[PDB]
Amino acid sequence: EITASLVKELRERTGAGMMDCKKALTEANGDIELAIENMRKSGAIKAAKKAGNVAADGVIKTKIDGNYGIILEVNCQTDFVAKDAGFQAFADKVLDAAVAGKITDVEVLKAQFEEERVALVAKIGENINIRRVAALEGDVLGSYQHGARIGVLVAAKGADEELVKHIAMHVAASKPEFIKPEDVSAEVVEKEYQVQLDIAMQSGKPKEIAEKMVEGRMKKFTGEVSLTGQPFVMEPSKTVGQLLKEHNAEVTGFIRFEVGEGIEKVETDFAAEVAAMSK
Amino acid sequence: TKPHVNVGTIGHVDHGKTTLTAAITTVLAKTYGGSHVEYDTPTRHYAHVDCPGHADYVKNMITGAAQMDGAILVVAATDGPMPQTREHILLGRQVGVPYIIVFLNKCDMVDDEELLELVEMEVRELLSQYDFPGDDTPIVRGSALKALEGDAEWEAKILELAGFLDSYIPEPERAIDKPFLLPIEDVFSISGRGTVVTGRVERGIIKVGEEVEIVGIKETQKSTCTGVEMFRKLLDEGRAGENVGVLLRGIKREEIERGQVLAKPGTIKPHTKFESEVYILSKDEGGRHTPFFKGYRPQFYFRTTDVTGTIELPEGVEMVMPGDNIKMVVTLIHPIAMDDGLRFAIREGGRTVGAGVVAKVLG
Ligand SMILES: Nc1nc2c(ncn2[C@@H]2O[C@H](COP(=O)(O)OP(=O)(O)O)[C@@H](O)[C@H]2O)c(=O)[nH]1
C-alpha cells in the first residue's frame, strides 16, 4: 500500500528526504505517525554523521524582556541554511525559551532542544548547533543586530532608546572588551607595559625615552579596549565617554557576539577538489 | 574564437556538485578530446564556478567575477529538494541568472519511476515560484559518480546535460555585436578638421558617416562621425576593444567632456537614480577603516569619471561596515549614461573604497 501519494503525504508533513520517507513508510506498513516515529530514531544517526562537520555560519539573535536580555548563537554550515525559514524558526524558538526560562547554561538549552535539532538536521542535511548563550541584566536594555552576523546587548542608566541603540551599534563596529579604561586590571596593564617596553627597547630607543613612550602607550591601550575610551563611531571627534557625559548617562554592561567567532575559516579549492575526483 | 559561456553549480553540500563537475570534464574529454574549472564541447568553451555561499557569490559578482550566463541546479533524486533549495533558487533570481538547468543526481539509487517524477515536479514548482520557467526547464536524470566510473549509460546523461548547456543557454552576445559605445576620456580641438574625442571602444563599431549621440552629464547631443583614427593614422572604422580618436561634425570642444559616452543613437540613456548591489572593501583590502551611515556622500565612478551621489539604505539598515555587502538606492547629482548591469567604483577623496553594480535603473 506504499503509493507515491502516501510517500508524497509523509514528505509534505516532515520535509524528510524522499527515499527516507519511502523506507520509513514501508517499514511502518503505511502508518504515517509510526513512520514519523521511525524517522525520529533514524534521524539521530543522520545528525550524528554531520556532528563532526564545521558549522561556522548561522545567526546571532537577541531578545529583551524588561530588565533581562538574551544573546544567542546558533550555527549551521552555509548561509543558505542560515536564511532558511525553518532554521530561522528554530533559532527563534530557542531564543524565546532562553528568555522565558532565564536560561544562561547553554547545555540546558541544548538538552531542551536536542530532539528538535536532530529533526531539523535530518531534514536540512547540515550540522546545526546551539553554540552559546548569555544574559545581560540592566535598568535599561537595548539591542542591535548587524544583519544576522553580529548581535549586541547594552545595559545603561539615564539613556533613551536612541542613545542605547547608537552605543550598541558602536559596540558592534568597534568591539570593546571593557566598559571603562580603569576596568582593565593592574596586572594586565603591567603585562602589556612589559610587552611594549621590550619592543621599544629592541628598536634602539634609549631606556629613559622608551619608558616614557610606553607610559603613553598604556593610556592608548586601555582607551582602545574600553567602550568609553573609544572614539564614537558616529562622531569620532568625541569618545563614547564624552557622549555619555553629554547625555548624563552611563553604560553598566554590554555583550557582543559574532557568528563563527573562534571557529577557523576552512578554505576551499573547488578546482583542486574537482581534479582530485578526476582520477 | 569559440564562444565563451560562464556557468556555475548551485545546490546542497552533499548532493554531488563537485562529482558532477568532475564528471562533466571527464566525459567531455573522453568524448571530444582536447577557483574555476574549464571544459569544451565542439561548439562552446565553458568557465565553471561553484556557488557555495550566498554572500560570497554576490561579492564575487560585484568585484568582477563574470556573471553566470546559466546555472546548473544540482539536486540528488534520493532526497529531492531541501528546504534551502528555495534559497539556492532565490539567489539565482536575485543576481538575475538568465537560465537554470537541473541535474538530478544519484538517479542510480532511485528505483521507482513515480518517485523520480515526484522529485521532478517539486523542482519545477520551486523554479516557477521564483519565476523561472519550471515547465520548460531541462531536467537531466543522471548519476555523476557512475558516469565518472565510466558507465556508458550514465556518461550519456552527462553528454545530455552538455547538450542542454549548448542549446538552452543562448550564445552570449559579443561586444562587437552590441550597439556602438565609447566612453570619452579626452576632448581635443583641431582647426581645419574639428573636434576629436578619445577613448577605447567598449562595444560595437564606429564608421565614418555614422550618427552618434553624446550622452550623460549634459543634455544629449547628436553628431556625425567624420573620421576615426588610431595613433594619428586614419581608419575606415573603430572596433570594440580598440583605442581610437573619433572626429565629430560641427560639435565644438567646449560642448563635450570626459565621462560622457559616444553611442549609437537611441541605444543608451542618461539616468540619475538607481538600485544597486554594493560591496564595501575591508580595511585589509585597502578600504575604509570605519563604518559609514545614512548621510554618506561618496563619488560613483562610472567608466571614466566620478559623480557624487547620496544613498538610501535598505529598511532596518543603519550602518555599513568595511567588508559588508548591501543593496542601496543611489541618487546622483547629475545624470550619467547607464544600463542595468553596469559596474561602478565607490570612491572617497579619489580613492576606491567599494564596488557596485547597477541592478535596476529608476529615474
Ligand atoms: N551515490 C552517489 N553519490 C554521489 C553521486 N554524485 C555525488 N555523490 C555524493 O556527493 C558527495 C560529495 O559530493 P559533493 O556534493 O560536492 O560534496 P563534498 O565534496 O563533500 O563537498 C559524496 O559523498 C557522494 O556520495 C552519485 O552519482 N551517486
XYZ file of C-alpha atoms and ligand atoms in Angstrom:
670
model
C 0.000 0.000 0.000
C 3.043 2.266 -0.318
C 1.772 4.539 -3.067
C 3.555 7.582 -4.463
C 0.666 9.572 -2.977
C 1.325 8.197 0.547
C 5.056 8.970 0.175
C 4.108 12.457 -1.005
C 1.950 12.954 2.112
C 4.696 11.930 4.551
C 7.164 14.176 2.725
C 4.900 17.244 2.998
C 4.497 16.643 6.734
C 8.149 16.097 7.590
C 10.172 17.687 4.793
C 12.248 14.495 5.028
C 14.168 13.042 2.081
C 12.048 11.242 -0.500
C 13.795 7.894 -0.152
C 13.920 8.210 3.641
C 10.135 8.697 3.559
C 9.635 5.640 1.311
C 11.720 3.482 3.645
C 10.076 4.667 6.879
C 6.563 4.323 5.478
C 7.320 0.838 4.093
C 8.657 -0.399 7.458
C 5.594 1.172 9.175
C 3.119 -0.659 6.907
C 1.772 2.746 5.750
C 1.109 4.285 9.197
C 2.193 7.933 8.869
C 2.501 8.528 12.577
C 4.611 5.414 13.062
C 6.813 6.382 10.070
C 7.384 9.774 11.662
C 8.398 7.937 14.854
C 10.707 5.612 12.871
C 12.283 8.619 11.128
C 12.867 10.120 14.580
C 15.226 7.281 15.554
C 16.904 7.235 12.161
C 17.355 10.981 12.370
C 19.605 10.848 15.465
C 22.068 8.716 13.442
C 21.839 11.046 10.412
C 22.646 14.009 12.652
C 25.461 12.133 14.373
C 27.090 11.693 10.958
C 27.097 15.509 10.481
C 28.063 16.424 14.035
C 31.743 16.456 13.085
C 31.315 18.973 10.233
C 32.460 22.501 10.878
C 29.417 24.756 11.323
C 30.790 28.282 11.223
C 27.850 30.035 9.595
C 24.471 30.726 11.156
C 22.952 33.526 13.202
C 23.193 35.731 16.274
C 19.824 36.552 17.823
C 18.939 38.891 20.678
C 15.775 39.393 22.672
C 14.908 41.629 25.579
C 12.244 41.223 28.283
C 12.248 44.214 30.627
C 15.387 44.035 32.757
C 16.585 40.798 31.180
C 18.107 40.184 27.730
C 19.441 37.128 25.945
C 22.025 36.853 23.181
C 22.327 33.565 21.328
C 24.430 31.891 18.633
C 23.019 29.061 16.533
C 25.337 27.689 13.831
C 24.950 25.847 10.516
C 27.293 25.120 7.638
C 26.118 27.560 4.886
C 24.487 30.954 4.818
C 21.800 29.474 2.523
C 20.618 27.486 5.538
C 21.143 30.466 7.844
C 18.470 32.283 5.751
C 16.043 29.388 5.560
C 12.692 29.942 7.331
C 12.884 26.600 9.180
C 16.367 27.272 10.562
C 15.241 30.797 11.482
C 12.176 29.484 13.291
C 14.279 27.002 15.278
C 16.725 29.701 16.343
C 13.798 31.981 17.291
C 12.187 29.209 19.324
C 15.455 28.606 21.251
C 15.767 32.341 21.886
C 12.198 32.667 23.175
C 12.765 29.787 25.578
C 16.065 31.199 26.871
C 14.347 34.481 27.652
C 11.226 32.905 29.166
C 13.237 30.481 31.298
C 16.144 32.848 32.037
C 18.434 30.141 30.784
C 22.127 31.008 30.657
C 23.588 27.492 30.706
C 23.829 26.531 27.074
C 23.794 22.795 27.995
C 20.298 23.214 29.442
C 19.157 24.884 26.236
C 20.876 22.184 24.202
C 19.129 19.401 26.149
C 15.716 21.023 25.781
C 16.073 21.322 22.004
C 18.117 18.264 21.043
C 15.179 16.303 19.566
C 14.004 19.293 17.538
C 17.601 19.986 16.467
C 18.020 16.444 15.262
C 14.785 16.550 13.264
C 15.930 19.822 11.691
C 19.369 18.359 10.823
C 17.839 15.254 9.436
C 15.754 17.377 7.045
C 18.214 20.220 6.210
C 21.297 17.958 5.951
C 23.762 20.384 7.650
C 25.210 20.246 11.113
C 23.258 22.628 13.328
C 24.499 23.537 16.799
C 23.214 25.750 19.634
C 26.672 27.073 20.481
C 26.411 29.712 23.167
C 24.004 31.883 25.108
C 24.441 34.759 27.544
C 22.245 37.108 29.545
C 22.624 40.770 30.325
C 20.629 42.379 33.057
C 20.151 46.088 33.442
C 17.989 49.026 34.277
C 17.572 49.996 30.609
C 18.400 47.392 27.913
C 18.777 47.767 24.174
C 19.963 45.615 21.310
C 21.445 45.950 17.841
C 21.557 43.330 15.083
C 24.009 43.873 12.257
C 22.216 41.554 9.885
C 22.381 38.038 11.241
C 26.133 38.094 11.798
C 26.639 40.403 14.785
C 24.380 40.947 17.742
C 24.781 43.282 20.707
C 23.097 43.859 24.040
C 23.735 47.027 26.029
C 22.721 47.905 29.542
C 22.520 51.508 30.629
C 21.286 54.117 33.068
C 19.903 57.523 32.092
C 19.894 56.786 28.360
C 16.918 56.963 25.954
C 16.143 54.364 23.298
C 18.139 56.096 20.601
C 21.276 56.605 22.674
C 21.271 52.925 23.747
C 20.867 51.877 20.134
C 23.765 54.052 18.996
C 26.035 52.676 21.721
C 25.034 49.106 20.710
C 25.933 49.967 17.108
C 29.252 51.358 18.274
C 29.983 48.133 20.192
C 29.117 46.104 17.124
C 31.582 48.042 14.990
C 34.423 48.654 17.479
C 34.412 45.592 19.745
C 35.479 46.988 23.130
C 36.155 44.342 25.759
C 35.804 46.566 28.785
C 33.404 49.375 29.729
C 35.917 51.908 31.138
C 39.711 52.174 30.906
C 40.060 51.858 34.711
C 38.341 48.409 34.436
C 41.492 46.971 32.857
C 43.238 45.193 35.716
C 46.570 46.432 37.012
C 48.000 43.020 36.308
C 47.024 43.169 32.593
C 48.249 46.723 32.205
C 51.605 45.748 33.759
C 51.974 42.741 31.347
C 51.172 44.931 28.381
C 53.657 47.533 29.686
C 56.460 44.925 29.617
C 55.418 43.797 26.109
C 55.668 47.354 24.829
C 58.920 48.103 26.673
C 60.592 45.008 25.146
C 59.524 46.160 21.694
C 60.572 49.767 22.277
C 63.946 48.704 23.712
C 64.937 46.437 20.839
C 64.148 49.230 18.304
C 67.122 51.165 19.724
C 65.209 53.663 21.888
C 67.281 54.579 24.988
C 65.755 53.271 28.232
C 64.566 56.645 29.574
C 62.907 57.517 26.262
C 61.378 54.034 25.876
C 59.899 54.119 29.402
C 58.178 57.441 28.784
C 56.902 56.419 25.370
C 55.497 53.220 26.833
C 53.635 55.091 29.613
C 51.909 56.930 26.783
C 51.160 53.679 25.003
C 49.427 52.285 28.117
C 46.915 55.123 28.084
C 46.316 54.449 24.412
C 45.978 50.714 25.217
C 43.332 50.998 27.946
C 41.480 53.594 25.882
C 41.380 51.381 22.767
C 39.960 48.310 24.517
C 37.345 50.171 26.607
C 33.944 51.383 25.404
C 34.149 54.864 26.988
C 37.716 55.435 25.751
C 36.900 54.613 22.114
C 36.025 57.310 19.555
C 32.264 57.211 18.978
C 31.700 55.630 15.526
C 29.018 58.120 14.564
C 31.055 61.197 15.662
C 34.682 60.185 16.177
C 35.849 63.624 17.311
C 34.392 62.547 20.676
C 34.791 59.435 22.755
C 31.791 57.397 23.855
C 32.593 58.559 27.397
C 32.163 62.142 26.331
C 28.946 61.174 24.525
C 27.593 59.590 27.714
C 28.540 62.554 29.853
C 26.750 64.903 27.390
C 23.594 62.874 27.991
C 24.085 62.399 31.742
C 24.089 58.649 31.105
C 26.215 55.601 31.836
C 26.743 52.097 30.482
C 26.600 49.264 33.028
C 27.179 46.338 30.676
C 27.378 45.010 27.132
C 27.804 41.774 25.190
C 28.799 41.304 21.553
C 28.533 38.009 19.672
C 29.644 37.467 16.090
C 28.820 34.337 14.116
C 31.740 31.900 13.929
C 33.996 33.689 16.389
C 36.708 31.270 17.417
C 35.985 28.762 14.638
C 38.697 28.592 11.976
C 37.792 29.670 8.447
C 38.054 26.491 6.328
C 39.429 27.327 2.889
C 38.012 25.637 -0.192
C 39.750 24.962 -3.533
C 36.955 23.905 -5.953
C 39.214 23.368 -8.984
C 41.550 21.155 -6.945
C 38.676 19.104 -5.472
C 37.324 18.529 -8.989
C 40.793 17.467 -10.184
C 41.072 15.006 -7.274
C 37.861 13.274 -8.302
C 39.023 13.239 -11.951
C 41.100 10.081 -11.492
C 37.159 32.268 -31.454
C 34.910 29.642 -29.862
C 32.008 31.222 -27.893
C 32.625 31.516 -24.142
C 29.906 30.688 -21.629
C 30.115 31.230 -17.888
C 28.245 28.625 -15.830
C 28.088 27.653 -12.193
C 26.771 24.896 -9.960
C 24.475 25.532 -7.038
C 22.948 23.015 -4.627
C 23.159 21.218 -1.306
C 26.644 20.459 0.046
C 26.065 16.660 -0.146
C 24.213 16.385 -3.452
C 27.281 15.996 -5.680
C 28.209 19.326 -7.309
C 31.910 18.526 -7.203
C 31.356 14.986 -8.547
C 29.195 16.292 -11.353
C 31.697 18.936 -12.404
C 34.455 16.332 -12.435
C 32.202 14.043 -14.420
C 31.498 16.782 -16.973
C 35.229 17.352 -17.502
C 35.990 13.622 -17.711
C 33.204 12.677 -20.139
C 33.653 15.699 -22.409
C 37.399 14.877 -22.650
C 36.780 11.175 -23.388
C 34.135 12.076 -25.950
C 35.616 15.109 -27.705
C 39.264 15.018 -26.617
C 41.164 18.272 -26.143
C 38.805 28.802 -8.350
C 37.139 27.636 -11.576
C 37.099 24.643 -13.927
C 37.111 24.704 -17.744
C 35.738 22.315 -20.364
C 34.764 22.312 -24.067
C 32.070 20.927 -26.314
C 32.644 21.118 -30.062
C 30.790 24.438 -30.261
C 31.374 26.099 -26.874
C 34.053 26.799 -24.256
C 32.853 26.819 -20.647
C 34.117 28.509 -17.494
C 32.530 26.824 -14.499
C 32.456 28.046 -10.856
C 30.839 26.756 -7.702
C 28.361 28.792 -5.667
C 28.787 27.554 -2.083
C 27.780 30.814 -0.337
C 25.146 33.429 -0.946
C 27.130 36.484 0.247
C 30.298 35.060 -1.296
C 28.641 34.744 -4.699
C 27.212 38.267 -4.570
C 30.594 39.684 -3.526
C 32.398 37.823 -6.340
C 29.834 39.036 -8.916
C 30.281 42.645 -7.755
C 34.094 42.652 -7.550
C 34.495 41.433 -11.113
C 33.833 37.718 -11.417
C 31.910 37.389 -14.713
C 28.222 36.749 -14.125
C 26.859 33.316 -14.891
C 25.140 33.024 -18.245
C 23.471 29.931 -16.786
C 23.364 27.911 -13.605
C 23.203 24.158 -13.056
C 20.996 23.361 -10.056
C 22.152 20.030 -8.663
C 19.571 18.079 -6.628
C 20.044 14.458 -5.564
C 16.921 12.462 -6.533
C 17.265 10.366 -3.401
C 16.277 13.363 -1.211
C 14.572 15.702 -3.641
C 14.831 19.445 -2.959
C 15.955 20.535 0.547
C 14.352 23.417 2.450
C 17.290 25.604 1.447
C 16.777 24.702 -2.211
C 14.438 27.663 -2.343
C 17.334 29.902 -1.094
C 19.534 28.499 -3.886
C 16.951 29.412 -6.467
C 16.230 32.762 -4.790
C 19.945 33.582 -5.170
C 19.573 32.863 -8.903
C 16.640 35.233 -9.138
C 18.383 37.936 -7.077
C 21.513 38.084 -9.274
C 19.272 37.511 -12.324
C 20.911 34.404 -13.766
C 19.183 34.127 -17.161
C 18.765 30.317 -17.231
C 18.741 27.333 -14.914
C 19.187 23.741 -15.893
C 18.660 20.962 -13.392
C 20.813 17.914 -12.921
C 19.037 15.295 -10.891
C 21.893 13.366 -9.338
C 22.135 9.827 -7.860
C 19.247 8.503 -10.013
C 21.048 5.146 -9.922
C 19.942 4.845 -6.276
C 16.257 5.504 -7.056
C 14.370 2.514 -8.496
C 10.817 3.889 -8.526
C 9.905 5.894 -11.635
C 6.951 7.507 -9.822
C 9.313 8.803 -7.126
C 11.614 10.407 -9.690
C 8.551 12.127 -11.137
C 7.524 13.465 -7.691
C 11.033 14.896 -7.264
C 10.911 16.393 -10.739
C 7.523 18.047 -10.166
C 8.752 19.550 -6.886
C 11.765 21.100 -8.603
C 9.635 22.574 -11.434
C 7.213 24.078 -8.914
C 10.076 25.640 -6.919
C 11.574 27.112 -10.043
C 8.244 28.613 -11.108
C 7.697 30.068 -7.631
C 10.715 32.271 -8.358
C 9.527 32.995 -11.923
C 11.937 30.653 -13.688
C 10.125 28.732 -16.457
C 9.701 25.485 -14.499
C 7.560 23.783 -17.178
C 10.265 24.229 -19.823
C 13.330 23.724 -17.668
C 15.667 20.934 -18.867
C 15.989 18.346 -16.117
C 18.599 15.628 -16.608
C 18.230 12.339 -14.692
C 21.822 11.368 -14.140
C 24.485 9.916 -11.929
C 27.702 11.875 -11.563
C 29.600 9.098 -9.781
C 28.609 6.288 -12.150
C 29.465 8.479 -15.174
C 32.815 9.243 -13.549
C 33.254 5.475 -13.164
C 32.780 5.190 -16.903
C 29.361 3.540 -17.053
C 28.241 4.129 -20.632
C 24.584 4.622 -19.663
C 25.380 7.425 -17.258
C 28.060 9.050 -19.424
C 25.296 9.632 -21.947
C 23.434 11.639 -19.336
C 26.496 13.808 -18.804
C 26.525 14.297 -22.629
C 22.817 15.167 -22.449
C 23.485 17.856 -19.808
C 26.236 19.229 -22.055
C 23.821 19.299 -24.976
C 21.490 21.482 -22.908
C 24.347 23.758 -21.877
C 24.849 24.122 -25.636
C 21.222 24.520 -26.715
C 19.434 26.050 -23.764
C 21.928 28.767 -22.859
C 21.956 31.135 -25.822
C 25.348 32.228 -27.200
C 26.332 35.286 -25.143
C 26.376 38.464 -27.279
C 29.897 39.581 -28.201
C 30.989 43.176 -27.541
C 31.465 43.811 -31.263
C 27.861 42.834 -31.982
C 26.427 45.273 -29.409
C 25.366 48.829 -30.345
C 28.332 51.228 -30.536
C 29.550 52.803 -27.322
C 32.771 54.736 -26.490
C 33.483 56.223 -23.051
C 35.089 59.622 -23.631
C 38.406 60.158 -21.941
C 39.786 63.294 -23.619
C 38.488 66.031 -25.977
C 40.740 67.957 -28.384
C 40.138 70.684 -30.955
C 41.583 70.515 -34.460
C 41.355 73.546 -36.796
C 40.502 72.580 -40.374
C 39.113 69.254 -39.189
C 37.131 69.746 -35.970
C 36.514 68.166 -32.576
C 38.125 64.801 -31.661
C 37.165 62.701 -28.636
C 39.339 59.778 -27.498
C 38.703 56.522 -25.721
C 38.553 52.774 -26.051
C 35.546 51.475 -27.952
C 33.634 49.383 -25.413
C 31.158 47.882 -27.833
C 30.267 47.755 -31.485
C 31.823 49.663 -34.328
C 32.011 53.303 -35.384
C 32.476 54.180 -39.082
C 32.884 57.458 -40.873
C 29.481 58.884 -41.819
C 27.552 57.438 -38.912
C 25.488 59.433 -36.443
C 26.306 59.325 -32.749
C 24.740 60.604 -29.571
C 26.792 62.200 -26.824
C 25.141 61.006 -23.648
C 25.471 61.859 -19.968
C 26.240 64.794 -17.661
C 24.725 67.397 -20.014
C 21.704 67.331 -22.276
C 22.161 64.721 -25.022
C 23.586 65.952 -28.317
C 23.798 64.310 -31.717
C 26.669 64.451 -34.177
C 28.098 62.670 -37.168
C 31.423 60.842 -37.219
C 33.630 62.421 -39.837
C 36.695 60.314 -39.145
C 38.283 57.660 -36.984
C 41.967 57.484 -36.135
C 44.480 55.454 -34.203
C 47.881 56.958 -33.264
C 47.259 59.769 -35.769
C 46.517 57.302 -38.634
C 43.058 57.316 -40.304
C 40.916 54.160 -40.052
C 37.855 53.171 -42.044
C 36.283 52.166 -38.692
C 36.848 51.755 -34.948
C 36.001 48.405 -33.327
C 35.226 47.237 -29.836
C 38.461 46.966 -27.851
C 40.378 49.499 -29.960
C 41.801 52.784 -28.601
C 40.719 55.448 -31.081
C 40.000 59.077 -31.732
C 36.599 59.881 -33.209
C 36.340 63.044 -35.258
C 32.974 64.796 -34.951
C 30.975 67.059 -37.271
C 30.200 70.574 -36.152
C 30.196 69.972 -32.421
C 32.797 72.073 -30.556
C 35.416 71.243 -27.931
C 33.623 73.055 -25.109
C 30.374 71.109 -25.834
C 31.803 67.685 -24.892
C 33.582 66.344 -21.785
C 35.147 63.332 -20.143
C 32.618 60.970 -18.562
C 30.159 61.384 -21.431
C 29.790 58.489 -23.883
C 29.525 58.335 -27.635
C 26.764 55.920 -28.597
C 24.641 54.633 -31.420
C 21.529 56.893 -31.414
C 18.663 55.678 -29.276
C 20.619 52.893 -27.535
C 21.636 54.330 -24.148
C 20.035 56.896 -21.863
C 21.246 59.083 -19.015
C 19.898 58.382 -15.506
C 20.339 59.760 -12.004
C 18.633 57.270 -9.700
C 19.217 53.511 -9.468
C 19.064 50.392 -7.265
C 22.409 48.679 -6.801
C 24.247 45.809 -5.159
C 27.368 47.104 -3.440
C 30.406 45.682 -1.750
C 32.448 47.813 0.643
C 36.152 46.919 0.804
C 37.618 45.702 4.068
C 40.491 47.530 5.742
C 42.882 44.782 4.606
C 41.642 45.186 1.040
C 42.731 48.828 1.226
C 39.289 50.163 2.102
C 37.757 52.289 4.883
C 38.792 51.671 8.461
C 35.421 52.731 9.903
C 31.677 52.340 9.216
C 29.508 54.823 7.375
C 25.910 55.872 7.966
C 22.894 57.167 6.124
C 24.464 60.536 5.263
C 27.473 59.062 3.432
C 28.090 61.026 0.215
C 30.667 59.293 -1.924
C 31.545 59.502 -5.604
C 30.319 56.870 -8.000
C 32.890 56.184 -10.710
C 31.244 55.202 -13.990
C 33.674 54.252 -16.787
C 35.833 57.382 -16.904
C 34.509 59.803 -14.289
C 33.318 60.374 -10.706
C 29.725 61.556 -9.983
C 28.727 62.470 -6.399
C 25.704 60.659 -5.054
C 23.626 60.256 -1.947
C 22.371 56.876 -0.732
C 19.312 55.280 0.745
C 19.994 52.268 2.844
C 17.551 49.327 2.963
C 14.876 49.345 5.637
C 16.276 48.381 9.011
C 19.898 49.092 7.982
C 21.581 51.966 9.762
C 25.284 51.232 9.430
C 27.629 49.879 6.823
C 30.911 48.315 7.945
C 34.048 47.628 5.866
C 33.602 44.201 4.235
C 29.795 44.395 4.073
C 27.765 43.812 1.008
C 24.367 45.518 0.740
C 21.750 46.888 -1.583
C 21.444 50.636 -1.908
C 19.458 53.169 -3.821
C 21.702 55.818 -5.250
C 20.747 59.315 -6.445
C 23.478 61.040 -8.468
C 23.879 64.846 -8.591
C 23.704 64.723 -12.357
C 22.858 62.064 -14.972
C 25.298 59.553 -16.393
C 24.777 57.112 -19.291
C 23.786 53.761 -17.780
C 22.038 50.396 -18.159
C 21.213 47.571 -15.775
C 24.407 45.598 -15.165
C 26.828 48.490 -15.413
C 29.697 48.229 -12.840
C 30.977 51.204 -10.870
C 33.531 52.022 -8.162
C 32.667 53.835 -4.962
C 35.321 56.387 -4.097
C 36.088 58.978 -1.484
C 38.766 61.597 -1.889
C 39.563 59.894 -5.184
C 40.339 56.516 -3.534
C 38.308 53.382 -4.218
C 36.507 52.063 -1.113
C 33.900 49.846 -2.755
C 32.345 48.415 -5.875
C 28.861 48.075 -7.202
C 26.594 47.024 -9.997
C 23.533 48.850 -11.252
C 20.673 46.448 -10.557
C 17.739 48.499 -11.726
C 17.517 51.981 -13.186
C 14.798 54.081 -11.588
C 14.859 57.627 -12.941
N 25.649 7.551 -4.730
C 26.071 8.632 -5.358
N 26.609 9.625 -4.625
C 27.024 10.715 -5.327
C 26.929 10.868 -6.697
N 27.448 12.099 -7.062
C 27.848 12.659 -5.901
N 27.608 11.865 -4.845
C 27.911 12.191 -3.425
O 28.380 13.514 -3.340
C 29.232 13.574 -2.171
C 30.361 14.549 -2.422
O 29.993 15.453 -3.462
P 29.558 16.952 -3.057
O 28.043 17.001 -3.018
O 30.146 18.000 -3.971
O 30.154 17.102 -1.562
P 31.607 17.439 -0.945
O 32.707 17.031 -1.898
O 31.764 16.662 0.342
O 31.686 18.916 -0.641
C 29.800 12.167 -1.983
O 29.665 11.778 -0.610
C 28.956 11.237 -2.862
O 28.304 10.252 -2.051
C 26.332 9.756 -7.460
O 26.177 9.740 -8.700
N 25.926 8.670 -6.699
